[PDB]
RNA sequence: CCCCCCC
RNA sequence: CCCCCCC
RNA sequence: CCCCCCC
């Protein structure tokens, strides 16, 4: 019975990877970038969104991506978008009287944001004592990273739903971005997070651009505290969309007894096949669901309902499951595993 | 008695593979493609089929394949059709007053679809408040993928019959494509599925084209949710036409005792020969029945009636068999295996 | 179809 | 998010 | 002849 063996998942991945034809999408579309020579200007804009209370926050995500384009460069951004499987043609950014004319961003919106911020600055300078510290002004150099930090908070929740993503973004930004909130009392994290979620859903190639910024930021030798925060959040997004694999390795670490049941041991073979596929893809496997790479879904453990039920039960017993909205296929295994996991958690055994 | 050994299946595959002559079919036939430069137009068409209620849905499959041709490119599509063993000459697509003139698709049909959709758009804009969201309009960029998703749903049922294929397509599309159904309330999945089944049966080389799209989609680094859904369904079609091999490896995983009977052990040798042939073909073995490759049928286990009866009985015991319409050659083994499989399923044993 | 928690 | 002492 | 279920 040794030769009755199939190896379907390896075959599916082999078909998907060895393709001699390249897909083509977004052929007639264009997007905006800003060259690095305008960074000192875009910083102002990226901060002139933050300390004023604006009626419309529609293109804040585009301004964050513009700052990313200044950091990487126009040519590198065009190359990344082209190599992301999307033939979107970059349109450069110009200046006019100075302010920016970003492609796809109406000049009325930029003028409105600038005028609102100038009025707020005049109000906070006329009434107050004129003692604005160095960190409270819009031209601070970490403001674009603070906006990209809101973008990165909503980035970690791209596998989740929109409402959960916004709630988590606001909840985590009231604490993660406490210092920026103190510096800028009136920054509307909900609306900026909504703009960033809309951008990531509509223009999916900007997810690849956003990931390249994380790499270009993580590889740097030095950085400010805003950039260190951004990289921390970006790496917190790494295993997004594959929490089932992480909880499975957690269950294996917990030495759950129900892993030895007959059906779990039956499915362990193809489970190990999924993990082998993870290793085969390697470091870029974690970014599959963040990029919405169609190759994602080869890592799904949905074809092993009993293993998934045991792992979810173990997670629920340890309290890791939290408020996870996933499905439990086999409820009896789930309840037994949850009970055993709680029993193991309660007991304190030391070797 | 060691030398009394034949190895017929390896010899049959050796004859089939080592052929110095190439077959020629469809010599005088032609088909239509659309170059990538017209993608932004074809998208409109592929969506202008979806939100209106059309009397005739005859060429919807051809419009989906046209979008595939835009994605891959005209030259790559001609090369794939030529390398699929079919000498069909691609005819390019032109525009006229703008609309498309697709070869083999009557201009009356395209005009009818466009006019019906325009009338529906006028009716839903005049009566309603003129608040059409960004996802509900025909020019949405995932509409061609939604049509190809209906095509992929009926693609997974090409080994099955037409009526079963249509019923399964409608049943699965009411849930898989729920979001598109909400966005486009009036999309007739039955008629579009009928058009796609007709296309796949008549023009069999388009199955190869359709498979190339799946690969060109799976190899991409990023994709929208429609394309991720399409790749998920396309990979769900992988082992199509060879569920007997999958249920055999399932039975081996179940450690069915009746695998050790005399006749099953007699046939296990040539069964292992079939599985070895599967490995010999490798990753492309799963797509044999989807492509209607004549080499398919070398993977048939119909020459092992007792092994097939035991495997089907095991599947019926575990409940996997569902409503499978296959034949049970040896009924006694089938009933005993089904009884044992139910007994194993009922008992809950943990190691 | 997949995904879905917390930091 | 991370970090947080003493020399 | 082969294929035939569910997701």
XYZ file of C-alpha atoms (C1' of nucleotides) in Angstrom:
723
model
C 0.000 0.000 0.000
C 3.093 2.188 -0.199
C 2.565 3.232 -3.789
C -1.036 4.431 -3.392
C 0.011 8.048 -2.997
C -1.047 11.187 -4.846
C 0.560 14.465 -3.662
C -2.100 16.796 -5.074
C -1.060 20.044 -3.362
C 2.502 19.881 -4.657
C 1.082 19.246 -8.123
C -1.260 22.251 -7.891
C 1.577 24.521 -6.806
C 3.791 23.102 -9.547
C 1.146 23.973 -12.134
C 0.684 27.479 -10.748
C 4.390 28.343 -10.506
C 5.610 26.919 -13.859
C 3.678 29.242 -16.161
C 5.258 30.581 -19.348
C 2.583 33.262 -19.812
C 2.234 36.530 -17.914
C -1.127 37.972 -16.961
C -2.072 41.498 -18.020
C -4.459 43.747 -16.109
C -5.151 47.458 -15.645
C -3.844 48.027 -19.173
C -5.515 51.389 -19.743
C -5.219 52.704 -16.180
C -2.860 55.215 -14.595
C -1.738 56.158 -11.094
C 0.134 59.064 -9.524
C 3.628 59.207 -8.058
C 5.752 61.990 -6.559
C 9.532 62.138 -7.144
C 11.890 62.303 -4.170
C 12.845 65.880 -5.086
C 9.403 66.941 -3.806
C 9.577 65.025 -0.506
C 10.105 68.148 1.602
C 6.856 69.418 0.095
C 4.803 66.235 0.413
C 5.809 65.958 4.071
C 4.030 69.259 4.650
C 0.913 67.925 2.961
C 1.098 64.650 4.870
C 1.141 66.686 8.084
C -1.281 69.362 6.965
C -3.889 66.564 6.977
C -3.219 65.735 10.631
C -3.637 68.763 12.918
C -6.817 70.219 11.391
C -10.404 68.952 11.397
C -11.312 68.357 7.747
C -14.776 67.682 6.360
C -13.494 65.380 3.582
C -10.659 62.882 4.129
C -11.076 61.179 0.761
C -7.500 61.157 -0.618
C -5.438 60.882 2.593
C -4.380 57.369 1.583
C -3.189 58.670 -1.765
C -1.057 61.264 0.036
C 0.502 58.542 2.188
C 1.270 56.511 -0.922
C 2.690 59.667 -2.498
C 5.128 59.959 0.394
C 6.054 56.300 -0.112
C 6.735 57.125 -3.764
C 9.010 59.982 -2.701
C 10.903 57.633 -0.400
C 11.431 54.857 -2.951
C 11.616 57.066 -6.034
C 9.441 57.418 -9.114
C 11.351 54.883 -11.210
C 11.476 52.246 -8.470
C 7.738 52.699 -7.915
C 6.992 52.262 -11.611
C 9.161 49.145 -11.680
C 7.457 47.658 -8.601
C 3.993 48.286 -10.039
C 5.042 46.709 -13.338
C 6.579 43.684 -11.584
C 3.441 43.292 -9.442
C 1.565 41.956 -12.479
C -0.196 45.267 -13.158
C 0.522 47.451 -16.185
C -0.523 50.714 -14.570
C 1.353 53.649 -16.080
C 2.749 56.042 -13.475
C 1.915 59.713 -14.011
C 4.340 62.156 -12.438
C 3.498 64.993 -10.065
C 3.974 68.689 -10.788
C 3.780 71.868 -8.731
C 1.749 75.036 -9.189
C 1.063 78.334 -7.447
C 3.495 76.473 -3.939
C 1.258 73.380 -3.933
C 1.083 69.960 -5.579
C -0.959 68.753 -8.572
C -1.284 65.015 -7.922
C -2.864 62.893 -10.643
C -6.301 61.635 -9.665
C -6.435 63.997 -6.673
C -8.585 67.055 -7.308
C -6.839 70.368 -6.710
C -9.936 71.530 -4.839
C -9.360 68.848 -2.192
C -5.697 69.782 -1.679
C -6.559 73.485 -1.536
C -9.353 72.780 0.953
C -7.025 70.793 3.223
C -4.343 73.476 3.035
C -6.790 76.309 3.737
C -8.399 74.481 6.666
C -4.994 73.747 8.182
C -3.823 77.344 7.694
C -6.978 78.630 9.386
C -6.450 76.213 12.278
C -2.812 77.308 12.566
C -3.856 80.960 12.636
C -6.455 80.234 15.320
C -3.982 78.305 17.493
C -1.344 81.012 17.045
C -3.527 84.080 17.631
C -5.259 82.825 20.777
C -2.349 80.910 22.296
C 0.988 82.355 23.442
C 2.871 81.569 20.231
C 4.939 78.814 21.866
C 4.424 76.047 19.287
C 6.948 73.285 20.085
C 9.096 71.645 17.432
C 6.934 68.509 17.240
C 3.491 70.142 16.993
C 3.860 71.889 13.688
C 2.704 70.326 10.395
C 6.166 70.501 8.849
C 7.404 67.901 11.325
C 9.354 65.183 9.465
C 7.577 62.210 11.065
C 4.032 63.275 10.125
C 4.040 61.308 6.819
C 5.103 58.267 8.789
C 2.283 58.898 11.268
C -0.188 58.858 8.382
C 1.451 55.732 6.991
C 1.148 54.309 10.514
C -2.619 54.715 10.345
C -2.360 53.103 6.916
C -0.336 50.238 8.365
C -2.816 49.736 11.193
C -5.611 49.310 8.673
C -3.195 47.217 6.563
C -2.954 44.519 9.209
C -6.751 44.149 8.980
C -7.098 43.672 5.223
C -7.947 39.988 5.569
C -10.689 40.950 8.048
C -13.862 42.903 7.259
C -14.180 46.679 6.864
C -16.041 47.361 10.115
C -13.759 45.145 12.200
C -10.776 46.724 10.483
C -11.896 50.257 11.315
C -12.788 49.404 14.914
C -9.427 47.709 15.463
C -7.601 50.593 13.781
C -9.219 53.176 16.062
C -8.760 51.049 19.179
C -5.101 50.353 18.471
C -4.323 53.873 17.279
C -5.616 55.461 20.481
C -2.725 53.637 22.218
C -0.059 52.933 19.577
C -0.229 56.518 18.290
C -0.772 58.164 21.665
C 2.241 60.448 21.254
C 1.040 61.704 17.870
C -2.450 62.196 19.310
C -0.967 64.334 22.086
C 1.053 66.299 19.530
C -1.969 66.625 17.192
C -5.121 66.632 19.356
C -7.462 66.757 16.335
C -6.534 63.877 14.029
C -9.452 61.761 12.826
C -8.177 58.185 12.797
C -11.567 56.767 11.646
C -11.744 58.790 8.426
C -8.069 58.312 7.543
C -8.436 54.578 8.148
C -11.510 54.533 5.908
C -9.559 56.277 3.148
C -6.694 53.792 3.448
C -8.991 50.757 3.434
C -10.712 52.111 0.327
C -7.357 52.636 -1.389
C -6.093 49.160 -0.542
C -9.283 47.536 -1.806
C -9.573 49.533 -5.032
C -5.904 49.680 -6.107
C -4.475 46.299 -5.114
C -1.036 46.959 -6.621
C -0.514 49.610 -3.959
C -0.446 46.777 -1.464
C 2.689 45.606 -3.218
C 3.997 49.159 -3.147
C 3.171 49.411 0.523
C 4.975 46.143 1.208
C 8.029 47.418 -0.637
C 8.071 50.419 1.662
C 8.083 48.121 4.649
C 11.085 46.324 3.241
C 12.839 49.522 2.249
C 12.190 50.748 5.765
C 13.228 47.578 7.559
C 16.497 47.353 5.662
C 17.566 50.866 6.720
C 20.383 51.251 9.237
C 18.693 54.102 11.155
C 15.213 55.513 11.517
C 13.072 57.768 13.625
C 10.606 56.443 16.188
C 7.759 56.820 13.701
C 9.519 54.551 11.197
C 10.375 52.001 13.883
C 6.706 51.989 14.852
C 5.690 51.550 11.226
C 8.010 48.583 10.778
C 6.757 47.045 14.017
C 3.168 47.209 12.777
C 4.100 46.063 9.263
C 5.761 42.974 10.702
C 2.751 42.435 12.951
C 0.840 42.110 9.674
C 3.123 39.371 8.340
C 1.090 36.245 8.898
C -2.134 37.950 7.894
C -4.787 35.662 6.498
C -3.061 32.514 7.761
C -3.788 32.471 11.482
C -4.937 28.877 11.100
C -1.376 27.727 10.385
C -0.058 29.692 13.366
C -2.680 28.203 15.658
C -1.821 24.761 14.310
C 1.832 25.124 15.215
C 0.651 26.514 18.567
C -1.439 23.370 19.100
C 1.526 21.178 18.190
C 3.614 23.111 20.721
C 0.876 22.551 23.325
C 1.102 18.756 22.823
C -2.658 18.383 22.566
C -3.671 14.756 23.114
C -6.499 14.925 20.558
C -3.904 15.394 17.834
C -3.521 11.614 18.111
C -7.154 10.758 17.255
C -7.821 8.632 14.183
C -9.216 11.335 11.892
C -6.637 13.967 12.842
C -3.875 11.415 12.225
C -5.560 10.642 8.905
C -5.415 14.288 7.836
C -1.954 15.006 9.295
C -0.348 13.825 6.052
C -1.903 16.504 3.884
C -1.518 19.021 6.729
C 2.227 18.375 6.654
C 1.939 18.786 2.893
C 0.530 22.292 3.429
C 3.357 23.170 5.802
C 5.896 21.810 3.309
C 4.353 24.064 0.673
C 4.775 26.986 3.081
C 8.480 26.173 3.391
C 8.722 25.727 -0.382
C 7.447 29.245 -1.026
C 9.656 30.478 1.812
C 9.877 34.030 3.148
C 7.309 35.513 0.739
C 4.597 33.047 1.822
C 3.412 35.284 4.655
C 2.675 38.187 2.307
C 0.407 36.104 0.075
C -2.924 37.160 1.581
C -1.767 40.734 2.172
C -0.987 41.070 -1.536
C -4.144 39.139 -2.490
C -1.877 36.889 -4.491
C -4.167 34.390 -6.259
C -1.707 31.662 -5.285
C -2.996 32.175 -1.754
C -5.571 29.572 -0.903
C -3.090 26.805 -1.547
C -2.239 27.323 2.128
C -5.839 26.861 3.242
C -6.468 24.138 5.808
C -10.185 24.066 4.974
C -9.811 20.607 3.411
C -8.941 19.160 6.858
C -12.082 19.830 8.905
C -11.105 17.597 11.835
C -7.609 19.063 12.173
C -9.088 22.560 11.946
C -11.659 21.716 14.608
C -9.007 20.362 16.983
C -6.738 23.383 16.459
C -9.584 25.859 16.991
C -10.606 23.993 20.131
C -7.065 24.152 21.477
C -6.930 27.877 20.721
C -10.260 28.412 22.479
C -9.019 26.513 25.515
C -5.843 28.567 25.765
C -7.877 31.765 25.323
C -6.058 32.696 22.115
C -9.230 32.303 20.030
C -10.607 35.560 21.403
C -13.521 36.487 19.152
C -12.486 34.568 16.051
C -15.312 34.291 13.533
C -14.041 31.181 11.749
C -16.087 28.040 11.290
C -15.779 24.931 13.455
C -16.545 21.966 11.170
C -16.553 19.168 13.778
C -18.073 20.452 17.023
C -17.380 17.395 19.212
C -13.626 17.526 18.639
C -13.723 21.289 19.174
C -15.438 20.980 22.552
C -13.213 18.142 23.759
C -10.048 19.982 22.671
C -11.223 23.209 24.292
C -11.899 21.350 27.544
C -8.489 19.653 27.481
C -6.742 22.929 26.645
C -8.440 24.693 29.554
C -7.456 21.790 31.811
C -3.822 22.084 30.715
C -3.909 25.866 31.168
C -5.299 25.623 34.703
C -2.714 23.098 35.895
C 0.746 24.469 36.711
C 3.337 21.755 36.047
C 7.079 22.482 36.152
C 9.825 20.103 35.030
C 7.621 -17.238 -10.680
C 9.484 -13.940 -10.454
C 9.894 -13.502 -14.181
C 6.220 -13.969 -15.103
C 5.577 -10.239 -15.219
C 4.114 -8.024 -17.929
C 3.803 -4.296 -17.075
C 1.131 -3.472 -19.660
C 0.162 0.022 -18.469
C 3.719 1.334 -18.621
C 3.971 -0.113 -22.125
C 0.732 1.576 -23.232
C 1.894 4.931 -21.898
C 5.294 4.421 -23.514
C 3.612 3.855 -26.875
C 1.377 6.900 -26.475
C 4.119 9.311 -25.374
C 6.889 8.317 -27.845
C 5.154 9.385 -31.050
C 7.106 11.038 -33.862
C 3.952 12.240 -35.643
C 1.726 15.159 -34.681
C -2.032 15.055 -35.068
C -3.827 17.726 -37.092
C -7.403 18.842 -36.481
C -9.588 21.902 -37.052
C -7.452 22.721 -40.093
C -9.975 24.964 -41.834
C -11.484 26.537 -38.709
C -10.998 29.936 -37.098
C -11.637 31.531 -33.714
C -11.714 35.071 -32.343
C -9.305 36.833 -30.004
C -9.096 40.367 -28.600
C -5.723 42.107 -28.095
C -4.822 43.505 -24.680
C -5.066 47.061 -26.037
C -8.861 46.606 -26.059
C -9.135 45.208 -22.514
C -10.631 48.396 -21.074
C -13.362 48.005 -23.687
C -13.997 44.278 -23.288
C -14.318 44.741 -19.526
C -17.313 46.967 -20.212
C -18.863 44.285 -22.392
C -18.112 41.571 -19.847
C -19.991 43.655 -17.277
C -22.696 44.914 -19.597
C -23.845 41.267 -19.726
C -24.238 41.088 -15.944
C -26.569 43.791 -14.587
C -29.305 43.595 -17.239
C -31.877 40.893 -17.986
C -31.138 39.692 -21.524
C -33.344 37.471 -23.665
C -30.384 35.760 -25.391
C -27.195 34.799 -23.525
C -25.709 32.839 -26.418
C -22.165 34.278 -26.675
C -21.431 35.170 -23.028
C -18.817 32.407 -22.905
C -17.126 33.845 -25.970
C -16.943 37.235 -24.241
C -15.319 35.635 -21.196
C -12.786 33.918 -23.437
C -12.239 37.250 -25.185
C -11.289 38.792 -21.851
C -8.909 35.877 -21.264
C -7.362 36.642 -24.655
C -6.899 40.276 -23.631
C -5.188 39.167 -20.431
C -2.768 36.719 -22.058
C -2.379 38.551 -25.362
C -3.286 37.689 -28.936
C 0.059 36.093 -29.794
C 0.219 33.987 -26.629
C -3.339 32.803 -27.281
C -2.506 31.811 -30.849
C 0.571 29.957 -29.615
C -1.391 28.110 -26.908
C -4.082 27.053 -29.379
C -1.418 25.852 -31.814
C 0.444 23.941 -29.081
C -2.835 22.379 -27.897
C -2.851 20.136 -30.978
C -5.392 22.286 -32.835
C -4.558 24.332 -35.928
C -7.277 26.922 -35.428
C -6.279 30.260 -36.937
C -6.929 33.209 -34.624
C -8.868 36.096 -36.161
C -8.297 39.462 -34.527
C -10.944 41.815 -33.170
C -11.710 45.284 -34.510
C -13.827 48.202 -33.336
C -16.620 50.122 -35.033
C -19.091 52.909 -34.320
C -17.533 52.564 -29.945
C -18.249 48.813 -29.910
C -16.498 45.548 -30.754
C -16.722 43.352 -33.870
C -15.785 39.907 -32.545
C -15.356 37.112 -35.078
C -18.145 34.557 -34.877
C -20.224 36.838 -32.636
C -23.015 38.594 -34.508
C -23.014 42.372 -34.169
C -26.763 42.201 -33.562
C -26.167 40.245 -30.345
C -23.584 42.720 -29.020
C -25.799 45.674 -29.937
C -28.785 44.007 -28.262
C -26.831 43.411 -25.045
C -25.513 46.974 -25.034
C -28.940 48.498 -25.695
C -30.637 46.374 -23.026
C -27.984 47.314 -20.476
C -28.201 51.015 -21.377
C -31.984 50.917 -20.981
C -31.618 49.195 -17.607
C -29.039 51.786 -16.533
C -31.364 54.610 -17.560
C -34.244 53.025 -15.642
C -32.155 52.536 -12.487
C -30.792 56.082 -12.736
C -34.045 57.923 -13.481
C -36.144 56.276 -10.769
C -33.458 55.942 -8.102
C -31.572 58.779 -6.390
C -28.534 58.658 -8.675
C -26.281 57.212 -5.959
C -24.746 54.314 -7.913
C -21.807 52.999 -5.845
C -18.409 52.269 -7.349
C -18.975 48.499 -7.468
C -22.455 48.441 -9.040
C -21.652 49.923 -12.397
C -20.877 47.773 -15.462
C -17.448 49.326 -15.951
C -16.259 47.718 -12.721
C -12.893 45.995 -13.308
C -13.823 42.672 -11.679
C -16.927 42.010 -13.804
C -14.998 40.004 -16.460
C -13.611 37.888 -13.657
C -17.131 37.407 -12.289
C -18.208 36.077 -15.682
C -15.114 33.887 -15.832
C -16.062 32.741 -12.322
C -19.372 31.448 -13.648
C -17.323 29.861 -16.424
C -15.000 28.283 -13.870
C -17.916 26.961 -11.833
C -19.250 25.171 -14.894
C -15.640 24.192 -15.716
C -15.322 22.075 -12.592
C -18.337 20.068 -13.814
C -17.127 19.211 -17.316
C -16.551 15.562 -16.437
C -20.134 15.412 -15.118
C -23.316 15.720 -17.188
C -24.905 18.937 -18.467
C -27.899 18.978 -16.114
C -25.831 18.142 -13.034
C -23.292 20.733 -14.124
C -25.905 23.474 -14.435
C -27.602 22.587 -11.147
C -24.274 22.575 -9.304
C -23.239 25.833 -10.976
C -26.418 27.612 -9.872
C -26.301 26.137 -6.370
C -22.663 27.058 -5.830
C -22.939 30.465 -7.484
C -25.781 31.562 -5.211
C -23.223 31.319 -2.365
C -19.748 31.654 -3.913
C -20.824 34.699 -5.940
C -23.110 36.189 -3.304
C -21.278 39.522 -3.319
C -21.596 39.871 -7.093
C -25.269 38.896 -6.857
C -25.806 41.667 -4.305
C -23.942 44.120 -6.538
C -25.824 42.920 -9.657
C -29.276 41.711 -8.542
C -30.257 40.577 -12.060
C -27.544 38.227 -13.320
C -28.792 34.968 -14.820
C -26.314 32.315 -13.706
C -28.253 29.478 -15.445
C -28.052 30.975 -18.939
C -24.423 32.086 -18.605
C -23.508 28.623 -17.336
C -25.324 27.073 -20.297
C -23.362 29.283 -22.692
C -20.065 28.328 -21.052
C -20.848 24.604 -21.065
C -21.745 24.835 -24.751
C -18.483 26.643 -25.505
C -16.361 24.141 -23.598
C -18.011 21.198 -25.339
C -17.894 22.622 -28.867
C -14.444 24.276 -28.850
C -12.268 21.942 -26.779
C -9.061 23.922 -27.343
C -10.575 26.725 -25.285
C -10.301 24.400 -22.322
C -6.559 24.589 -22.806
C -6.840 28.351 -23.136
C -8.932 28.489 -20.003
C -6.373 26.397 -18.138
C -3.612 28.737 -19.260
C -5.543 31.616 -17.754
C -5.697 29.783 -14.465
C -1.947 29.378 -14.528
C -1.337 32.937 -15.645
C -3.601 34.014 -12.817
C -2.123 31.758 -10.157
C 1.419 32.842 -10.941
C 0.603 36.539 -10.410
C 1.971 38.300 -7.336
C -1.245 40.261 -6.650
C -4.884 40.034 -7.616
C -8.323 41.279 -6.751
C -10.816 39.205 -4.779
C -12.515 38.115 -7.998
C -9.257 36.662 -9.338
C -8.487 34.950 -6.033
C -11.952 33.410 -6.178
C -11.375 32.302 -9.757
C -8.093 30.621 -8.866
C -9.707 28.936 -5.869
C -12.395 27.424 -8.091
C -9.922 26.543 -10.854
C -7.820 24.605 -8.365
C -10.969 22.975 -7.013
C -11.321 21.606 -10.548
C -7.847 20.047 -10.544
C -8.570 16.399 -9.928
C -11.625 16.445 -12.158
C -12.513 13.131 -13.725
C -10.270 11.156 -11.369
C -12.183 11.077 -8.096
C -11.641 7.325 -8.002
C -7.909 7.795 -7.399
C -8.592 10.354 -4.666
C -11.059 8.045 -2.956
C -8.524 5.233 -3.220
C -5.867 7.220 -1.407
C -8.590 8.201 1.080
C -9.346 4.510 1.661
C -5.651 3.771 2.137
C -5.507 6.603 4.678
C -8.542 5.099 6.444
C -6.707 1.758 6.864
C -9.679 -0.236 5.628
C -9.336 -3.890 6.635
C -10.914 -5.163 3.403
C -7.924 -3.812 1.503
C -6.235 -7.014 2.691
C -8.702 -9.430 1.037
C -7.370 -11.856 -1.560
C -8.797 -10.212 -4.684
C -7.948 -6.656 -3.629
C -4.390 -7.785 -2.860
C -4.361 -9.460 -6.273
C -5.269 -6.207 -8.020
C -3.107 -3.944 -5.822
C -0.142 -4.543 -8.131
C -1.740 -2.982 -11.181
C -3.383 -0.344 -8.962
C 0.087 0.705 -7.819
C 1.005 0.668 -11.500
C -1.738 3.236 -12.165
C -0.502 5.434 -9.330
C 3.066 5.138 -10.633
C 1.807 6.289 -14.025
C 0.193 9.272 -12.291
C 3.557 10.184 -10.763
C 5.263 9.609 -14.118
C 3.044 12.159 -15.847
C 3.453 14.439 -12.833
C 1.801 17.820 -12.294
C -0.114 17.850 -15.600
C -1.857 14.535 -14.831
C -4.727 16.235 -13.013
C -5.650 18.342 -16.045
C -5.995 15.318 -18.326
C -9.773 14.922 -18.105
C -10.374 18.676 -17.997
C -8.534 19.042 -21.307
C -10.145 15.862 -22.683
C -6.640 14.684 -23.412
C -7.007 11.313 -25.177
C -4.198 10.014 -22.970
C -6.738 10.173 -20.156
C -8.228 6.778 -19.536
C -4.818 5.332 -18.824
C -5.584 6.442 -15.264
C -8.868 4.540 -15.156
C -9.255 2.014 -12.351
C -12.104 0.265 -14.180
C -9.901 -2.790 -14.780
C -9.813 -3.451 -11.001
C -13.470 -4.069 -10.136
C -12.805 -5.427 -6.637
C -10.509 -2.560 -5.637
C -13.040 -0.088 -7.032
C -15.844 -1.769 -5.103
C -13.894 -1.648 -1.831
C -12.941 2.011 -2.326
C -16.511 3.029 -3.182
C -17.767 1.143 -0.140
C -15.282 2.932 2.096
C -16.339 6.274 0.622
C -20.004 5.430 1.191
C -19.280 4.496 4.791
C -17.453 7.743 5.490
C -20.265 9.689 3.800
C -17.945 11.079 1.126
C -19.765 9.187 -1.644
C -22.680 11.609 -1.463
C -24.731 11.000 -4.601
C -22.017 9.500 -6.781
C -23.434 7.832 -9.880
C -20.522 5.466 -10.507
C -20.893 1.722 -10.840
C -20.192 -0.771 -8.057
C -18.897 -3.933 -9.765
C -18.741 -6.252 -6.727
C -21.675 -5.522 -4.413
C -20.674 -7.798 -1.509
C -17.321 -6.085 -0.996
C -19.045 -2.713 -1.341
C -21.576 -3.488 1.388
C -19.008 -4.971 3.767
C -16.636 -2.020 3.260
C -19.454 0.480 3.736
C -20.456 -1.240 6.980
C -16.871 -1.278 8.267
C -16.352 2.361 7.277
C -19.504 3.418 9.122
C -18.338 1.412 12.139
C -14.967 3.180 12.095
C -16.660 6.566 11.672
C -18.995 6.005 14.625
C -16.235 4.958 17.026
C -14.101 7.759 18.482
C -10.610 6.407 19.194
C -7.736 8.700 20.207
C -4.082 7.682 20.464
C -13.974 29.738 -2.777
C -10.734 31.736 0.845
C -10.173 35.006 5.063
C -12.038 36.500 9.818
C -9.107 37.417 17.276
C -5.253 40.389 20.307
C -0.737 43.182 20.328
C 4.371 48.743 18.472
C 9.044 48.497 20.861
C 12.160 50.298 24.843
C 12.585 51.326 30.047
C 17.622 49.398 36.044
C 23.075 49.919 37.737
C 28.152 50.674 36.376
C -14.799 3.120 -23.729
C -14.082 6.595 -19.854
C -16.349 10.086 -16.466
C -20.189 10.965 -12.888
C -20.666 13.621 -5.287
C -19.593 18.194 -1.999
C -16.827 22.671 -1.291
